[PDB]
RNA sequence: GCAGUUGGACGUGGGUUAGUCGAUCCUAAGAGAUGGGGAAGCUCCGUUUCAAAGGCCUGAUUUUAUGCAGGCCACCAUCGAAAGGGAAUCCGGUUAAGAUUCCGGAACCUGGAUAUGGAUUCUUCACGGUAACGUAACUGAAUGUGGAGACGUCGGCGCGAGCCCUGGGAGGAGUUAUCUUUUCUUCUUAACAGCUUAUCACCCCGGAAUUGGUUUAUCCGGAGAUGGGGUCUUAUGGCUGGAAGAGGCCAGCACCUUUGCUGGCUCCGGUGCGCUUGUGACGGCCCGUGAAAAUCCACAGGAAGGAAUAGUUUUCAUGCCAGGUCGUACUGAUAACCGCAGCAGGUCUCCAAGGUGAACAGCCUCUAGUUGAUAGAAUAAUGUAGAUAAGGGAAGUCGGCAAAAUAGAUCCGUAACUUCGGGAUAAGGAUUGGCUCUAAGGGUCGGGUACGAUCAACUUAGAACUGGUACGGACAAGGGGAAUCUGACU
RNA sequence: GUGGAGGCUCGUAGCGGUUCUGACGUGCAAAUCGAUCGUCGAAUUUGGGUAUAGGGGCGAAAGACUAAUCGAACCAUCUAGU
């Protein structure tokens, strides 16, 4: 329900002790008629709100996935 | 252009109710729908809200008045009478 | 097809009219369009400097 | 009415439970004079007026 | 016979007043201490229209001298009164339009309104549009003031009684024709149910004394004694004279 | 050209039963009820909508912060800026003239 | 009221899931206790009254529970709206039958506990901005004030939403003797949250006659206009999250079967006196000026409480718990209501496609829904309903009853009388189709400090040509005039 | 020219109920059906709530209406009234 645009906030938020589940949604988008690209959405489920981080760069998305905690239950789709 | 010879604002009644009644109504409708000069702001903005209530758009002041005019002759006469009596007991 | 012919100007004579001229297109609508045109032009010109405010005023109230 | 009082609903439930024929073992009883259910009500024939 | 329409209004079922949109009773301020020893100042906040009433009302705000509070009062507005005007009420107040002086402390010829006929009734004589009371004279011993009321009557009332100086606003209201049954309908929609009026002579004799007949006619004299009873009093009750008024009232 | 129903059990076009037609992710038109619109808070003096204050229904003012309901001036969320200016000026000048009325009388009494 | 294998019939069962929808609560007109007073009395008045008419904050004590310590405050029952007021929910899916109630997902409010982070303080209870005002927060009791709640009707103008219309493109279906880059259809995006967005309004600078700005509608300006620059309400709209993972349209490959499984597309625009609806700013009308209360907030005030080796704040953020009772199926009517009944009657309201056309008129059609009403065979009289009739044209009849005639729109032309407003569509006449053209009426961009390009409207007028002189071609749609009696009119 | 007043007007929905003295008149109906008509932004129409109760109410007045009942309702009793 809220979008975040800071990755350090997202990492801090994944370690909030009420956060049990997260999701990684892959979308196929278009920047223009030349190049279609691969968008990633990291959705973390708090108690009151769902927080969504939109990463358009697969390189940053790959590192952000590795940087997740192991106690966090992650769903790819 | 001139659309009516003599009925004026009473053309909204057409041929009904009588000419004598329509003349009386015209005389007072012109007054109550007119604009009047504000004694406070000095502008031509005083209009009737309801019978006896005259409000200015500028300065937002509201004066109690006549039903179809801001001031009756009797009220002007009373204003002057009271001014004369007030200046009579102190002087 | 009928609308395309209406565009070309057909099916519009006196025998295909059942409402008044005002019912079909009100004089108030025509007036409003016309004044809006004239006032928009006058304001364009006053801004561009093709016309001064003193001519703008008399032309505004003439329009 | 759909928006109704509990009282009216309660009386309607009693009427739904009354809207029954006879059991037929009651007709086999010793010294039985009940043939049918005379207090039978239908929504089309007679209104409850509650 | 049947109970007639004028007998039927006293029960007050459909004949009561319609007081939904009335802002309150138009009363003078209670006569406490300041209004009989000095003056108290208040301020006119708005002049509002009162349903069922041609005269406008003024919402005047005074201060409570005994508690921190801002008691509001509903005056009948006098002609010339305006918003933000300071109203002064009491014994030692100044002879200006809108002030609530006593009648003893005003000169003769003074035009007042909303006059107490007894001190502390908080509003009586000269309350309607354009109406005013005139002071005529004084009896300082036997502390009394003679006044001309709008009817033409002369009345002796206490000098301690109060009145608002000036004329009640809304004057000239009855000079305009209504022209329309509908205008009368809307007039009486907010006052009470007293309109339209059926003529008793257009009725049956069960419904009215003047009812009946093969022509519309009253039959007996429409002048009814004061000692008649309810059901008989339909016409001109206790009429000293009758007919078109030819000359001065000689009062 | 889909047609919609009242989504509650009041079938009457009352103020509390205003509907807006809205298209849904299922593609269909649905009526959704709209709450009554909010009136702006007004100055006690002039009666004009005083700016800076959020426009809400009365109970919704309890859900928002103090910053949404006031401005940082005296009489902030109650009176207009110019009305506050007027009463400041009035207070200062009337108190000064009270002092002046006092010393005039203090002069006259010492004189007589 | 024929039939019946069917049924609102018969028999047997199943079925109505809520913190967010209502009730519940508020007050409205009004009803109605108490106190008191009447009345032989059943009971009547009256509703704040001639009454000794109550409960609210904070603690102090630490036998201890809660009195006394204090202070505060004075409305004086209660009932009264499933259309008025009102804390809070949406999408998708699911059943034989339930859904804003169930499942999934995503939110919000109230009430209560509460810890952390953040903010604040050694100038104790924050900073910035000339200002309008702004911000994540950034003490505040009694008492007081103010606002919201909270408000007519009509008219036109503006804006938005949905709908209608429509271009391109991606898909499916239909027609295809011939023509048709063709006809139909899908291409959707909630509540909520964040950033941004506005008419009115306001601020600063500045100082206006050669008067200017300006609305469709004429009002505003030395009580400070035009102008330049800004602040604000966030109705509403845009972007993002929600959210494509959903739903929709398709293709392909699978099977006694639970049956699926796998891939794709779900895009970019435009137009308007359009329809409906909401809203804004205005104007008009009134001897009519168009509810109240619960409830919430703000302000004034400054009681009281508070920091430095440590405190205070819980209108900022996050986190924890709970949210009762009742209703909820279905019809809402030529068969579920009332009329003795499965009666052509009556019975409150919302949504509302295309064409013709002034038009939710009449006529035709799409979506959706019905195809019900005892039938068959014949076509005598008399009927009911609909119609047509040569010549005449009210001779009929109490009486032109009934029916006919007229009828739309454009142009012309319009008398007596008159309260000068009307009469008046007076009367009375002409024209109207189809086709091919012509003319006129517009928006957006462009110019060192006259015009060109581009885009799109239905409105009017006119000319040729054409026809078995037809053309408001069906539908729709005034007969008129001269006079009297009478009631002024609605 | 603008503007858009009106207990104005033509005319739908609706409210009413003129004339056919039409249909029906053991009816579809203890008041309907059809056509023709009045009016259609207001003294309009209308739901719900509330008040007025029988010699009483309510009545723009017809002795109208007050549950198919009105120049005095309905129910029971006096009453097997005379
Ligand atoms: Mg032409
Ligand atoms: Mg039109
Ligand atoms: Mg015009
Ligand atoms: Mg009446
Ligand atoms: Mg009579
Ligand atoms: Mg008599
Ligand atoms: Mg008589
Ligand atoms: Mg008679
Ligand atoms: Mg703000
Ligand atoms: Mg603020
Ligand atoms: Mg049968
Ligand atoms: Mg059978
Ligand atoms: Mg009582
Ligand atoms: Mg209650
Ligand atoms: Mg309610
Ligand atoms: Mg209301
Ligand atoms: Mg409600
Ligand atoms: Mg269902
Ligand atoms: Mg759920
Ligand atoms: Mg700060
Ligand atoms: Mg208010
Ligand atoms: Mg208005
Ligand atoms: Mg979106
Ligand atoms: Mg919502
Ligand atoms: Mg300015
Ligand atoms: Mg919004
Ligand atoms: Mg509507
Ligand atoms: Mg249900
Ligand atoms: Mg249901
Ligand atoms: Mg249903
Ligand atoms: Mg219905
Ligand atoms: Mg239905
Ligand atoms: Mg029935
Ligand atoms: Mg019955
Ligand atoms: Mg058309
Ligand atoms: Mg409609
Ligand atoms: Mg049509
Ligand atoms: Mg039949
Ligand atoms: Mg003959
Ligand atoms: Mg009609
Ligand atoms: Mg009929
Ligand atoms: Mg007959
Ligand atoms: Mg017969
Ligand atoms: Mg009503
Ligand atoms: Mg008679
Ligand atoms: Mg009857
Ligand atoms: Mg016998
Ligand atoms: Zn003024
Ligand atoms: Zn102000």
From Swiss-Prot, chain A:
Example of a GO cellular component annotation carried by this entry: cytosolic large ribosomal subunit
Origin organism lineage: Eukaryota, Fungi, Dikarya, Ascomycota, Saccharomycotina
Domain of life per record: Eukaryota
Cystine residue pairs: none
Compartmental location: Cytoplasm
Name of the featured protein: Large ribosomal subunit protein eL38
Gene name in the database record: RPL38
Ribosomal protein as UniProt keyword: yes
UniProt GO molecular function: structural constituent of ribosome
KW Ribonucleoprotein (keyword) present: yes
Family recorded in the similarity comment: Belongs to the eukaryotic ribosomal protein eL38 family.
Subunit and interaction comment: Component of the large ribosomal subunit (LSU). Mature yeast ribosomes consist of a small (40S) and a large (60S) subunit. The 40S small subunit contains 1 molecule of ribosomal RNA (18S rRNA) and 33 different proteins (encoded by 57 genes). The large 60S subunit contains 3 rRNA molecules (25S, 5.8S and 5S rRNA) and 46 different proteins (encoded by 81 genes).
Key words of the record: Cytoplasm, Ribonucleoprotein, Ribosomal protein
Annotated organism of origin: Saccharomyces cerevisiae (strain ATCC 204508 / S288c)
Extra remark beyond the main annotation: Present with 50200 molecules/cell in log phase SD medium.
A biological-process GO annotation: cytoplasmic translation
UniProtKB/Swiss-Prot annotation, chain D:
Record's subcellular location: Cytoplasm
Region (Disordered): 1-21
GO biological process, one term: cytoplasmic translation
GO cellular component labels: cytoplasm; cytosol; cytosolic large ribosomal subunit
Domain of life: Eukaryota
A GO molecular-function annotation: structural constituent of ribosome
Keywords attached to this entry: Cytoplasm, Ribonucleoprotein, Ribosomal protein
Signal peptide: none
Compositional bias ranges of the Basic residues kind: 6-19
Keyword Lipid metabolism: no
Family matches, as Pfam families: Ribosomal_L39 (PF00832)
Major place of residence: cytoplasm
Annotated family: Belongs to the eukaryotic ribosomal protein eL39 family.
Protein purpose: Component of the ribosome, a large ribonucleoprotein complex responsible for the synthesis of proteins in the cell. The small ribosomal subunit (SSU) binds messenger RNAs (mRNAs) and translates the encoded message by selecting cognate aminoacyl-transfer RNA (tRNA) molecules. The large subunit (LSU) contains the ribosomal catalytic site termed the peptidyl transferase center (PTC), which catalyzes the formation of peptide bonds, thereby polymerizing the amino acids delivered by tRNAs into a polypeptide chain.
Assembly and binders: Component of the large ribosomal subunit (LSU). Mature yeast ribosomes consist of a small (40S) and a large (60S) subunit. The 40S small subunit contains 1 molecule of ribosomal RNA (18S rRNA) and 33 different proteins (encoded by 57 genes). The large 60S subunit contains 3 rRNA molecules (25S, 5.8S and 5S rRNA) and 46 different proteins (encoded by 81 genes). eL39 interacts with YIH1.
HAMAP family, per database record: Ribosomal_eL39 (MF_00629)
Name this polypeptide is given: Large ribosomal subunit protein eL39
Swiss-Prot record, chain E:
Modified residues (Phosphoserine): 51, 94, 158-159, 248
Keyword rRNA-binding appears in the UniProt entry: yes
Alphabetized InterPro entries for the sequence: NA-bd_OB-fold (IPR012340), Rib_uL2_dom2 (IPR014722), Ribosomal_uL2 (IPR002171), Ribosomal_uL2_C (IPR022669), Ribosomal_uL2_CS (IPR022671), Ribosomal_uL2_dom3 (IPR014726), Ribosomal_uL2_RNA-bd_dom (IPR022666), Translation_prot_SH3-like_sf (IPR008991)
Record location of the Glycyl lysine isopeptide (Lys-Gly) (interchain with G-Cter in ubiquitin) cross-link: 45, 92, 118, 144
Origin: domain of life: Eukaryota
Signal peptide from the UniProt entry: none
Pfam families: Ribosomal_L2, Ribosomal_L2_C
Record-linked SMART domains: Ribosomal_L2 (SM01383), Ribosomal_L2_C (SM01382)
Localization: Cytoplasm
Record carries keyword Ribosomal protein: yes
GO biological process, one term: cytoplasmic translation
A single cellular component GO annotation: cytosol
GO function term, MF aspect, one: rRNA binding
Keywords: Cytoplasm, Isopeptide bond, Phosphoprotein, Ribonucleoprotein, Ribosomal protein, RNA-binding, rRNA-binding, Ubl conjugation
PANTHER family assigned to the protein according to its UniProt record, in alphabetical order: LARGE RIBOSOMAL SUBUNIT PROTEIN UL2, RIBOSOMAL PROTEIN L2
Protein role: Component of the ribosome, a large ribonucleoprotein complex responsible for the synthesis of proteins in the cell. The small ribosomal subunit (SSU) binds messenger RNAs (mRNAs) and translates the encoded message by selecting cognate aminoacyl-transfer RNA (tRNA) molecules. The large subunit (LSU) contains the ribosomal catalytic site termed the peptidyl transferase center (PTC), which catalyzes the formation of peptide bonds, thereby polymerizing the amino acids delivered by tRNAs into a polypeptide chain.
Other information: There are 2 genes for uL2 in yeast.
Family: Belongs to the universal ribosomal protein uL2 family.
Protein name: Large ribosomal subunit protein uL2A
From Swiss-Prot, chain F:
Note: Present with 23600 molecules/cell in log phase SD medium.
GO terms of biological process kind: cytoplasmic translation; ribosome biogenesis
GO cellular component, one term: cytosol
InterPro entries cross-referenced by the UniProt entry: Ribosomal_eL34 (IPR008195), Ribosomal_eL34_C_sf (IPR038562), Ribosomal_eL34_CS (IPR018065)
Keyword Cytoplasm attributed: yes
PANTHER family recorded: 60S RIBOSOMAL PROTEIN L34
Protein function: Component of the ribosome, a large ribonucleoprotein complex responsible for the synthesis of proteins in the cell. The small ribosomal subunit (SSU) binds messenger RNAs (mRNAs) and translates the encoded message by selecting cognate aminoacyl-transfer RNA (tRNA) molecules. The large subunit (LSU) contains the ribosomal catalytic site termed the peptidyl transferase center (PTC), which catalyzes the formation of peptide bonds, thereby polymerizing the amino acids delivered by tRNAs into a polypeptide chain.
Name this protein carries in UniProt: Large ribosomal subunit protein eL34A
Family classification: Belongs to the eukaryotic ribosomal protein eL34 family.
Any one Pfam family match given in the protein's UniProt record, by short name: Ribosomal_L34e
Compartments where found: Cytoplasm
Keyword Lipid metabolism (UniProt): no
Alphabetical UniProt keywords: Cytoplasm, Ribonucleoprotein, Ribosomal protein
UniProt xrefs under Gene3D superfamilies: 6.20.340.10, 6.20.370.70
Single GO MF descriptor: structural constituent of ribosome
PROSITE patterns listed in its UniProt record: RIBOSOMAL_L34E (PS01145)
Organism from which the protein derives: Saccharomyces cerevisiae (strain ATCC 204508 / S288c)
């Amino acid at each position: 329900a809220r979008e975040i645009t800071d990755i350090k906030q997202f990492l801090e938020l994944t370690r909030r002790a009420d956060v049990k589940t997260a999701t990684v949604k892959i979308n196929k988008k278009l920047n223009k008629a030349g190049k279609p690209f691969r968008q990633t959405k990291f959705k973390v489920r708090g108690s009151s709100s769902l927080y969504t981080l939109v990463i358009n760069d697969a390189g940053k998305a790959k590192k952000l996935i590795q940087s997740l905690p192991p106690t966090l239950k992650v769903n790819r789709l | 252009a001139k659309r009516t010879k003599k009925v004026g604002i009473t053309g909204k009644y057409g041929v009904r109710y009588g000419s004598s009644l329509r003349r009386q109504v015209k005389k007072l409708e012109i007054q109550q729908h007119a604009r009047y000069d504000c004694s406070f702001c000095g502008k031509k903005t005083v209009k009737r809200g309801a019978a006896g209530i005259w409000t200015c758009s500028c300065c937002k002041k509201t004066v109690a008045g006549g039903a179809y005019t801001v001031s009756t002759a009797a009220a002007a006469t009373v204003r002057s009478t009271i001014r004369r009596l007030r200046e009579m007991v102190e002087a | 097809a009928h609308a395309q012919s209406k565009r070309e100007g057909r099916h519009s004579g006196y025998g295909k009219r059942k409402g008044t001229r005002e019912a079909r297109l009100p004089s108030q609508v025509v007036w409003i369009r016309r004044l809006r045109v004239l006032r928009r032009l006058l304001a364009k010109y006053r801004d561009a400097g093709k016309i001064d405010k003193h001519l703008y005023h008399v032309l505004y109230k003439e329009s | 009415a759909a928006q109704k009082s509990f009282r009216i609903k309660q009386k309607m439930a009693k009427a739904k439970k009354q809207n029954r024929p006879l059991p037929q073992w009651i007709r086999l009883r010793t010294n039985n004079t009940i043939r049918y259910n005379a207090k039978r009500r239908n929504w089309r024939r007679t209104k409850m007026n509650i | 016979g049947r109970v007639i329409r004028n007998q039927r209004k006293g029960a007050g079922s459909i004949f009561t007043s319609h007081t939904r949109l009335r802002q309150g009773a138009a009363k003078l301020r209670t006569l406490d201490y300041a209004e009989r020893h000095g003056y108290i100042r208040g301020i006119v906040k708005q002049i509002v229209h009162d349903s069922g009433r041609g005269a406008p009302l003024a919402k005047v705000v005074f201060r409570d001298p005994y508690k921190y509070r801002l008691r509001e009062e509903i005056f009948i507005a006098n002609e010339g009164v305006h918003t933000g005007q300071f109203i002064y009420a009491g014994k030692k107040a100044s002879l200006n339009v809108g002030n609530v002086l006593p009648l003893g402390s005003v000169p003769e010829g003074t035009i007042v309104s909303n006059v107490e006929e007894k001190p502390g009734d908080r509003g009586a004589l000269a309350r309607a549009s354009g109406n005013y009371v005139i002071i005529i004279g004084h009896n300082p011993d036997e502390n009394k003031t003679r006044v001309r009321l709008p009817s033409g009557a002369k009345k002796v009332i206490s000098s301690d009684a109060r009145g608002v100086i000036g004329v009640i606003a809304g004057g000239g209201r009855v000079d305009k024709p209504l022209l329309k049954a509908g205008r009368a309908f809307h007039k009486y929609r907010l006052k009470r149910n007293s309109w339209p009026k059926t003529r008793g002579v257009a009725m049956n004799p069960v419904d009215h004394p003047h009812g009946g007949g093969n022509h519309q006619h009253i039959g007996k004299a429409s002048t009814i004694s004061r000692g008649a009873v309810s059901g008989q009093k339909a016409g001109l009750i206790a009429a000293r004279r009758t007919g078109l008024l030819r000359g001065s009232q000689k009062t | 050209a889909q047609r919609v129903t009242f989504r509650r059990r009041n079938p009457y076009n009352t103020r509390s039963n205003k509907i807006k037609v809205v298209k849904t992710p299922g593609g269909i038109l649905r009526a959704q009820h709209v709450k009554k619109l909010a009136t702006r808070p007004k100055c006690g003096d002039c009666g004009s909508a005083l700016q800076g204050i959020s426009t809400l229904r009365p109970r919704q003012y309890a859900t928002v912060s103090k910053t949404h309901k006031t401005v940082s001036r005296a009489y902030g969320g109650s009176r207009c800026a110019n009305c506050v200016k007027e009463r400041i000026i009035r207070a200062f000048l009337i108190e000064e003239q009270k002092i002046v009325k006092k010393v005039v009388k203090e002069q006259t009494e010492a004189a007589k």
